[PDB]
């Protein structure tokens, strides 16, 4: 039905388990023809990733700590052992100390702010600038964000400035690389049920509120995000760059409950 990534290959970052946004995206991209490589943040994740990657015809899995520039250098050296070029990158990496994603934003620690900034924001710049070197004929990349970046979500705390910075960087990178025909966009996802509850202390409440008050009366699925990614990483979105694209079932447009 759709094979618009036939012959294409790319890197998926951020798979932790079968409920990860990065995994939902990977399944859709592979279904459209893409060959996939995966980073993984640790062995316990790597163990879950192996059987998943096999279901998308991949055994290309590379350990990487995105807080460490040398680790990211090594990631791309490993990619190049097999692939001279890349067509796309998916960056779906959200991290902060979850114990600080509770209570007022002002209690955010300097150390958590720095680490959250490096992992949730700057790692996209690090990854993009390495990957662009493998795109001599252009390509496309996405990162993931959330509307809590510039409207206030309780407990989201350190993740908010991080995601706002990430959105800003997405636009600057789109401008840096547009002349090379590399497009750079972000998906601003809504909360995904089950994932949300695991990701932050009030996640279940955030997802429930979002479902009850979105125009479509449902939360976004992993498959919806994957399909939006397929759009943003394929020729279908040839006219689109630097876009913060809401895939949140319309939640963002609602001013107050009906």
């Amino acid at each position: 039905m759709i094979n618009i990534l036939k012959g294409k290959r790319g890197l998926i970052m951020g798979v932790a388990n079968d409920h990860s946004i990065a995994w939902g995206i990977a399944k859709v991209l592979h279904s459209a023809g893409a060959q996939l490589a995966f980073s993984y943040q640790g062995e316990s994740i790597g163990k879950r990733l192996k059987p998943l990657a096999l279901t998308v015809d991949s055994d290309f899995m590379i350990p990487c700590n995105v807080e460490d520039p040398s680790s990211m250098d090594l990631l791309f050296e490993r990619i190049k052992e097999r692939w001279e070029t890349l067509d796309f990158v998916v960056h779906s990496i959200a991290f902060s100390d979850k114990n600080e994603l509770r209570g007022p934003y002002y209690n955010t620690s300097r150390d958590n702010f720095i680490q959250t900034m490096l992992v949730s924001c700057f790692s996209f710049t690090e990854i993009v600038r390495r990957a662009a070197q493998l795109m001599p004929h252009g390509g496309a990349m996405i990162t993931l964000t959330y509307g809590g970046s510039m409207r206030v979500v309780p407990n989201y705390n350190a993740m908010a400035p991080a995601k706002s910075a990430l959105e800003s960087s997405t636009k600057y990178l789109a401008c840096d690389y547009g002349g090379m025909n590399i497009r750079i966009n972000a998906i601003s996802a809504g909360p995904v049920r089950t994932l949300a509850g695991a990701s932050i202390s009030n996640g279940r409440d955030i997802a429930a509120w979002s479902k009850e008050n979105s125009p479509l009366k449902r939360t976004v699925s992993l498959e919806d995000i994957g399909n939006s990614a397929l759009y943003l990483l394929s020729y279908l979105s040839n006219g689109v760059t630097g876009e913060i694209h809401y895939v949140d079932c319309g939640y963002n447009i609602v001013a107050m409950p009906s």
Copy 2:
């Protein structure tokens, strides 16, 4: 004649010389009645600040390194020596490596990204959470930003995500402290003639373009910014918090030149 800050006391951060945004602000707030305390970064700045502060009837000058939490604690102990409470805080503190405010954003270094984030963004959180302890009956604070945070200005580079993160944190802090009747807002200033060229490589060109293409055909003055600060820090803006307020002579509204 204006005297709406009669009897009020406030902290001014970011005076480096008599062309600093923080200084234009200080002059306006003092003219409206405010008593001022000033932070200063380093001894040469201190020597410049002494005669300036005297012209606004202040000798209340306190050293502070906004990268050093211990130093910020000491700043507030020194304030508490004279003043049980504060009515307002002006945060006009921005820094990035000038060598990296040119060329593509993607060449931003990790260390510069981190330092720019800590100085230009997180220091506002550090300062606000200390200052709120001096505002038992409420008060008002502002920070300074620029529209390059979410629309791409050439060479603005690392400052862009930092300002975007700052704008995000402004809104989160406004929610944290609103229950205490502390209002927190940002002025998104346009470029100021002469300060602009001193601040960034192509600053003169940014200022000239903004002047030629703004609806008002002029650049914002230090006094304009100070008057807007006076609004945002006095009773006049009692209905305003979490606002990113553009004081850029309307430049932001223009889609393309006439």
